[PDB]
Amino acid sequence: APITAYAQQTRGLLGCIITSLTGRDKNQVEGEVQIVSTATQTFLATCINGVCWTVYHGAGTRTIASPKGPVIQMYTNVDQDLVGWPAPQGSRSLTPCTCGSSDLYLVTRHADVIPVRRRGDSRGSLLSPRPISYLKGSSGGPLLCPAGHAVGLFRAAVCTRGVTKAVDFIPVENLETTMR
């Protein structure tokens, strides 16, 4: 049915730092998109096909904190700007899109869903341009097709004068490629 989303915050500044250092995270996990932080930065990771993915330019080679200490990346592809860990216990994965639709829907770190028109393999245009401050920290989040299946991961925003009209994304296909 219709895409709708909500956000919940599970950790504050201080538990985040401590957890970053111990690499030990005991909180229960839910949902399909995880809000993630480093020391300097916060963004999104999306679970597709049992793996939790996000952008290399944010995570780098870093481990992810888990109930069992740090967990090493399963996939690392610098050219694709794509990184992946095994999906946390309790997360739920998105299904890759197979309908080839050109009407995409980007899920934001604030849990808004904004319409995007597909204009290429890896680029889409916003139907309503937005201030860049808005999309900040949404990198790593999903572009969905009308059925709610994953088409791609938000990679970068094309901004002019602080206003975004287009986004570049990593297509689901490149995920599957990276998996091989």
């Binding site: 989303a5 970053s20 399909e32 809000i35 993630v36 995570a59 992810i64 904190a65 770190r109 849990a111």
Partner: peptide
């Protein structure tokens, strides 16, 4: 270098609900 940390989540799979009292 520190581990990436889950600080929050977005849930896509919830559907319309009457808010409980």
């Amino acid at each position: 270098k520190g581990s990436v940390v889950i600080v929050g989540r977005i849930v896509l799979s919830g559907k319309p609900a009457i808010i409980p009292k």
